[model samples]
Target: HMASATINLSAEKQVIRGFGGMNHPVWISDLTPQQRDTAFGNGEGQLGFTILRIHVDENRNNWSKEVATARRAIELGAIVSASPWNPPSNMVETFTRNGVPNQKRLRYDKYGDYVQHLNDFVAYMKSNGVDLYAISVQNEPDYAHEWTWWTPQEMLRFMRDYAGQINCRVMAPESFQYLKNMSDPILNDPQALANLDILGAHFYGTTVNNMPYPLFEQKGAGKELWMTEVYVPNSDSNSADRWPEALEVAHNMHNALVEGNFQAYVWWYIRRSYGPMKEDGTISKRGYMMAHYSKFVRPGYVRVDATKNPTYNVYLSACKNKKDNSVVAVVINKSTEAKTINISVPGTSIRKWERYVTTGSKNLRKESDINASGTTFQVTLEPQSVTTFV
Candidate 1:
């Protein structure tokens, strides 16, 4: 059994920047023209993604199709950001280290030229009508096993010296494992911290209890924090694995906001077998789980005060949208049985509301209307499900 938890609209937290996913040119090349539009479009029936993460590939430059897709999303008011997995082949070197094979590292002598290369890529994208919102120095620098590797000192040096030369905001040290060892140097240094406009990190196997960056909160007031990559592999074709994994996405996102206080959440691949969109152009269960936050909680909405988790199995996160004068709350029920929750918003009155659930057979579906009086309402949360109340 699950107990009823009250959602206080008065309680809020960080202002949401956006939610998006990586748009790799290689993989995106295979998607149909209509499928491409569906991936980044924000029309009446589109996904309404606020950001589009593009790849700045040094190995290839066949960016025609990728740029075209991004242009459509840019025209639809989506922010574009570029990240490089590895520098050019000449910019990096390979050698055996401690009996290890294929140890790659950035060429220290070509540091200045490498910075220029990244700037040129940004300029090239801008010339193609897609102005980038930000550019990351490197993607997952901490775990550069088969790719170009950069030490924390290397990242700090570039951010302090070369990152400012870039035209727009600069993101740095995309830590693959939410490791403080990679980001601590940047936040601790004044010059490096000043140039780093965004703190991009990944949470592959992270937990809520240990994900908070206290130093960033106390020092990095102007800098943005983003969970740039994550993927829960619940193969979309396997219905048996959908509920548990899809429900886990909701829980992870809730922690991403409430615990880590990340302004933006970006998934790994936009359309994959176990990603947001399936091969058939239809949104998967994970995509619907993302919609709970991406669709309802638009960018700029402040995460106001809400009952975090009154019950052990029920998790909740709410936001206040000032632009539309609406409040949205996403509740996740992970228990085996359904839960009837009485949500109480003390600050204001909510006359009527709508709910969308993603569960066994639901996919962010709009169910019957829910009426409320004096900011209090009751709703049934299905077992192992995610429900968004708007």
Candidate 2:
């Protein structure tokens, strides 16, 4: 760890993923054709990042431009879902910003106005042939954002009033802490719950383990749980440079997928040092963990139970890729010692599979063949790092 002082995020309290990715203005016009080619250069052929969560401009930076960017992302063949943090200053009452809960008078009629603004943005994307799969009522109900404010009840009321009018699926409660807190009040309330098409939340301080994975299938939430936002960082942010990025990626992915068993995992950012993809649109060690599932696992892969391999710090989370019989079990070597893990693929015959490892290496795309009677292998894992076997 570095000898730097600790980072006290609570004081700053600004809205951002703690994993440390900076938001950049849309510079599509700035990226020359040659630059674009280099960014998309990796000939992975196909990297299955099925769902993408795009944040709307709190700055109100031209919806037309935003729609254009959405269209471009769609052209990349990604199923898109998006949400708005705050309406333009012209749309709110409590504060020009809705960053915080706006305890403003719950004028239920205005709920339609709120929905319309959100809908207009969605529709603009739709007109550009960008059919958004879903949109959330708000990002974090508990904490009013720097630009907007809404109490839990206010959000519930807003959803109940007009969420149905929207053509696309309406997701809500993106509680900063966990979905349980928001779900308890909303799901129990028939009127408010009806407005919600999807259940979503972020993994800020709450480790994915605390998300109550067992409770996801407990029934009656009337929605699905999406691990919407996450960051890759050691607890000690001040010492991040001294830390291994691969370790954080392994730890969080294991927690989010295996312990949380979330339907989807969205990094707090896509292009940053800490994001799965770098600012230049290249992959990071942390992002490569996504390949364990996003690229190899694919969608429609049902995660079956897995056996934990502690010697190698391999927390097995197995998902069978329906497209192919291949299964991806992400292995992380959390311990100081290197580990060699032999994984047993349940209910399948595997003569060969791919073993892609990321440790203290820059070229993570490199991989080896894994051949065990049941798709097993011995991985010489690096200490304090992550590895994925598909």
Candidate 3:
């Protein structure tokens, strides 16, 4: 079936912060120097990831573990952020949840100390030449089966009373499923909302219809919305390279950008066999899927209006780099048959369009460029593939 989309340059949306993944030096392993280059570099065979999420180990000694990779990522033009699984052990307490013993929670009286602990991490990273862009109070607070638990009221009290003291931008209540209840209290309380610089969430099993947060639209004016962590499809072994399975990564990002209006999309891990980057330090199929946006729609580029999903199983998202008046459009064709699509970008003098495509056998292969006569251009999309035009 024929499909068409019009790029609305005048109707701008969220300003893209970036696309990235997490790194855990303890649980997993540190990214080698070469792997760091492959993940953050915009060059050939690279993922072009612009944000790097590091872990804030509860143990102070492990803090040094995060510096090397973060410093390298920053030098390569990526911003570093951090999330803590638990507060320092001394600041935590054992609690009972539904008669389950030994549940973990941050001690109520230790809130001030917890804030200082987070600040120390920020300062330590800064002194080490890896200034963090933001730091989350807790990672997956709602799904803390093995980590520290936080109630909505607890998070709100901390945000209103202590989060502002953090040295850098503060993110909070990273719900494991993008659950609104985890963040609703913060948004409703002006004091708590005032302290929040970034409203963060996860998307483990969240559906497309639940992606958009109307309350955030009503109350989250200046704060940034970020999808802090997720690995699409599944984390099953050897699934990252599976064909069409990896395409879901692109689909997830499209919905996050267009439907959720998120400023940033971050994955669970930077290097895993089931992740964007594989264990052998090479970009995986999922890596190329992410590169469609990370390579072209860079930081500071705003998500402009576009005809999203002009046809069934086809998704499109467009962004413009106002600095150079350049535009980028990412299209995903999930059908089994190839589709020809017409794209029109009015109010811009876009003449030459470069196309990069990823499919079952292709890994972001650079296709021939398309020269537009006016503001319209047409291209055929490979079946079950993701393509980016610039």
CA deviation > 4 Å runs, candidate 2: 1-42, 45-48, 58-61, 95-109, 213-215, 220-222, 234-243, 308-312, 365-367, 374-382
lDDT of 3 by residue, 192-222 (tens): 9999999999999989999999999999999
User: Cα deviation in Å at residue 22, candidate 1?
Assistant: 1.6
Backbone clash numbers for all candidates listed:
6, 21, 0
Q: How accurate is candidate 1 locally (lDDT)?
A: 0.79
lDDT of 1 by residue, 1-390 (tens): 435556555556788998877777674544466765666665434566788888788754665656876887787677888888888888888866568878887788877888888888878888989888899999888788867778889888888888878887998788887888888899999988998999998888776776898989988979998888888643345432365767877788899998899899998777776777776777777777787788878889888777778676888888888776588889998988888777777766567889888787767778887787566777788788888888
| Model 3 bad stretches (over 4 Å) | none
Per-residue C-alpha lDDT of model 2 across residues 301-339, encoded as one tens digit per residue = 566566544543446566655555555666666777766
Q: How high is the CA lDDT of each candidate model?
A: 0.79, 0.57, 0.92
Q: C-alpha displacement of 222 in model 3, angstroms?
A: 1.2
Backbone clash total for model 3 is 0
Q: For model 2, what is the error of residue 213's alpha carbon versus the real structure, in angstroms, after optimal superposition? A: 5.1
Model 3, C-alpha of 316: deviation from truth (Å): 0.2
RMSD for each model, in Å, please?
2.3, 8.6, 0.9
- Regions more than 4 Å wrong, model 1: 1-11, 27-30, 42-45, 95-99, 233-241
lDDT of 1 at 166: 80
- Which pairs of residues collide in model 1? 11-304, 11-305, 12-303, 12-304, 12-305, 13-303
lDDT winner: 3
